[PDB]
Design a protein around this ligand. Structure first.
Ligand SMILES: *[C@@H]1O[C@H](CO)[C@@H](O)[C@H](O)[C@H]1NC(C)=O
Length: 361
């Protein structure tokens, strides 16, 4: 079973205890740690932060403690224009420059592979993504003849049916990819004017406005789309989402004035790290969507959907039962990485619960 964990670049800038560098990652936690994100500049893979070269180096030295640890670099993300990915991929010359540029850049900085994070191809892009992947792999195949062990290639895929049909030819890319991380935690559109959970595992009975909008839909659908189970990795979120409430209504359908106030360390309207969530829980009312098997919390005018040791465990049981290749965590800097907030001393409490479960019979 793989445990694929993301680390984010911009996490180093958060104040006081929120500051995370790759130094803090326990090297026996994950099987694969993925650095996010890399830029493309001059049609060529490239660093993003001013000091990525250093943080790459600090991450790749975690390999000294655990020589088996695999690392990847992720290209794209959202700060980065789909538009701009589209331009690179849809032309045979910009696509060629970029692909050729990737192996020596990985080798130089000590990575074992590439993660493609194009969020997200439009329908005109679908056929180019397929070509990118296909030719990117052939290049990793060509490079391996040089003696070093073959570079890994993975991709991050949205878990919403619409976005899947629109941008991906799953049958085709699964052939060349070493795994796919399914982004099963963006299932509650913020544009909706009500409460709701974003990584439910099951639809629930509550009403069924969408039956497609849950992890189990996403996984069965990829499998039916011809993604083999052994190349599929289910995404588990480590953060929560928050919404300010339009009333004292707090249950299914409860109306919303908008996103929740910024977390103290992440300072982003609508999102909270698990460590800022454990602190929010003090003085909160706690509930669990029985059917969707994930929790939520509320206090003052603030309502929060999130994952916990129990829901994270339960997802890991589900993916084993389904014989998926493993789990993906978003993300190491949003787990309680210091272990100081969440009562038990335990650091990376969310990621360790998964890890503990993956090891079970
Ligand atoms: C990424 O590359 C683009 C295009 O070359 C460049 O203009 C942009 O500023 C780069 N972004 C960062 C953060 O380095």
């Amino acid at each position: 079973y793989k445990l694929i964990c993301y680390y984010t670049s911009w996490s180093q800038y958060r104040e006081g205890d929120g500051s995370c560098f790759p130094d803090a990652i326990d090297p026996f936690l994950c099987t694969h740690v993925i650095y996010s994100f890399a830029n493309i500049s001059n049609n060529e893979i490239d660093t993003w932060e001013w000091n990525d070269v250093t943080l790459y180096d600090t991450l790749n030295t975690l390999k000294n403690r655990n020589p088996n640890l695999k690392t990847l670099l992720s290209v794209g993300g959202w700060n980065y224009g789909s538009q701009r990915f589209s331009k690179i991929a849809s032309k045979t010359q910009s696509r060629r420059t970029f692909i050729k540029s990737v192996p020596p850049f990985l080798r130089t900085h000590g990575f074992d592979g590439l993660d493609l994070a194009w969020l997200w191809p439009g329908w005109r892009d679908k056929r180019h993504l397929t070509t990118l992947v296909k030719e990117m792999k052939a290049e990793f195949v060509r490079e391996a003849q040089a003696g070093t062990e073959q570079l890994l290639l993975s991709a991050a895929v949205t878990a919403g049916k619409i976005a899947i049909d629109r941008g991906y030819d799953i049958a085709q890319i699964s052939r060349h990819l070493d795994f796919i991380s399914l982004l099963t935690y963006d299932f509650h559109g913020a544009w909706r004017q009500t409460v709701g959970h974003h990584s439910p595992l099951f639809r629930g009975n509550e009403d069924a406005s969408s039956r497609f909008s849950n992890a189990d839909y996403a996984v069965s659908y990829m499998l039916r789309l011809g993604a083999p189970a052994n190349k599929l990795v289910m995404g588990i979120p480590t953060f929560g989402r928050s919404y300010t409430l339009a009333s004292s209504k707090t249950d299914v359908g409860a109306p919303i004035s908008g996103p929740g106030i910024p977390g103290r360390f992440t300072k982003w309207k609508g999102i909270l790290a698990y460590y800022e969530i454990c602190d929010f829980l003090h003085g909160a009312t706690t509930h669990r969507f029985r059917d969707q098997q994930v929790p939520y919390a509320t206090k003052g005018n603030q309502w929060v959907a999130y994952d916990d040791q129990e829901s994270v465990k339960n997802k890991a049981r589900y993916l084993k039962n389904r014989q998926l290749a493993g789990a993906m965590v978003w993300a190491l800097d949003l787990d309680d990485f210091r272990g100081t907030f969440c009562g038990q001393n335990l650091t990376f409490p969310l990621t360790s619960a998964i890890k503990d479960v993956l090891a079970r019979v």
